[PDB]
Amino acid sequence: STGSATTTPIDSLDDAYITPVQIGTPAQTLNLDFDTGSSDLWVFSSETTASEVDGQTIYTPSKSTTAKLLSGATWSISYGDGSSSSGDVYTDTVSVGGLTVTGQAVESAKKVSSSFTEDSTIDGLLGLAFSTLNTVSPTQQKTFFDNAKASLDSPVFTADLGYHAPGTYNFGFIDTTAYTGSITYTAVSTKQGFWEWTSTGYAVGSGTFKSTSIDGIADTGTTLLYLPATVVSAYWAQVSGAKSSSSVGGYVFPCSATLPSFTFGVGSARIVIPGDYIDFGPISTGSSSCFGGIQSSAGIGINIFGDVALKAAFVVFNGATTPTLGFASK
């Protein structure tokens, strides 16, 4: 089997991407944030504290003839950005782009943090990291991909995120029309439950490539590119007037600037992030200070190849017995 679904930016900055997901019978379609940095499929629901729902579409398990309470199961998750959610668990039929999993754990939120409430466009998350990170207790549950894997034509999914435009998540096949040149594959460590890999270096603009190992995670659920402070300083030094602002919470730059590109290495291959991908716009409405899309990972404890990086590539998440990651230009 295969599936193919379009993923759409939630706003004009590509702050996140939503993908429609069918849950239950008859289908209830929710727009979920596909997150290769976590491993829970959780949704706003009829069980979510009413004051914490503000415009989201909810899953109502009582209206699904295939929903079953997973007795005794609870979940609770905290994300790298400080947000969180928790609740109980149903199993139900879940379909993405024509690919159907029966008995998928659907984690129903009883509580969500303010960041989730305030974002009316995201109805939940669909985790695509390794199932070892799944938070369901006392019986850990599998991701949608893990459940689908054996049925897929090939045990893979691909992320093709757009810049200020829709893109695609495919399951079970590689669309050879969706990228240019070849896909370069690189080793993955699953030790921390992430799609963790090592970039071979970087360049800023038309500058020389610096060969240096940068361990990090391919994370579709993180907006920005978080790299070591040395790398980030080298980038922003090429933008007149750019500075790290403790008050704002990262590097800012004059909105009048033209940003240089940023290149990262994948083996001997190179992925180029155009400068415009690194612009996250005014820090507040009407400001001439703009927020940068490359930020320091210092104090995160891990480097994160988030959407800023991934949207410059066609990315293969290869879930074979020994997982790997592939990157192609597009």
> What is the spatial distance between Cα 246 and Cα 77, in angstroms, rounded to a whole number?
27
Q: Which structure tokens are listed for 153?
A: 């034509």
Q: Do residues 107 and 87 make contact, with C-beta atoms less than 8 angstroms apart? A: yes
Resolution of this entry, Å: 1.1
Method for structure elucidation: X-ray
User: What are the residue ranges of helices labelled H in the chain?
Assistant: 114-117, 144-148, 229-236, 307-310
Residue 199 catalytic?
Answer: yes
- For 95, 188, 269, the CA distances from 58, given in Å and listed in that order, are 16, 35, 43
Q: Do residues 313 and 264 make contact, with C-beta atoms less than 8 angstroms apart? A: no
DSSP lists the bridge partners of residue 216 as: 197, 303
Nearest in space to 229 (alpha carbons), one of 306, 301, 293, 296: 296
A 10 A CB-CB count for 187 gives 12
DSSP lists the bridge partners of residue 30 as: 21
Residue 81's SS3 state is coil
> What is the spatial distance between Cα 58 and Cα 29, in angstroms, rounded to a whole number?
9
Nearest in space to 276 (alpha carbons), one of 36, 8, 17, 14: 14
Nearest in space to 311 (alpha carbons), one of 158, 99, 186, 208: 158
> What is the spatial distance between Cα 187 and Cα 271, in angstroms, rounded to a whole number?
17
Residue 103's SS3 state is strand
Omega before residue 26 within 30° of 0, cis:
yes
Domains annotated for the chain, with CATH where assigned, are: 5-174 (2.40.70.10), 175-330 (2.40.70.10)
Q: What angle do CA 312, 313, 317 make, to 5 degrees?
A: 140
Omega before residue 155 within 30° of 0, cis:
no
- For 74, 293, 300, the CA distances from 227, given in Å and listed in that order, are 34, 11, 10
State CA 193 to chain mean position distance: 14
- Given 35, 40, 119, 123, which residue is catalytic? 35
> What is the spatial distance between Cα 68 and Cα 115, in angstroms, rounded to a whole number?
29
Burial label, 150 (beta-carbon count in 10 A; 0-12, 13-18, 19+): exposed
Q: Do residues 253 and 235 make contact, with C-beta atoms less than 8 angstroms apart? A: no
Contacts of 208 (CB under 8 A, 6+ apart): none
**What count of Cα atoms within 13 Å lies in the side-chain half-sphere of residue 149?**
16
- Given 85, 95, 199, 261, which residue is catalytic? 199
Q: Do residues 195 and 36 make contact, with C-beta atoms less than 8 angstroms apart? A: yes
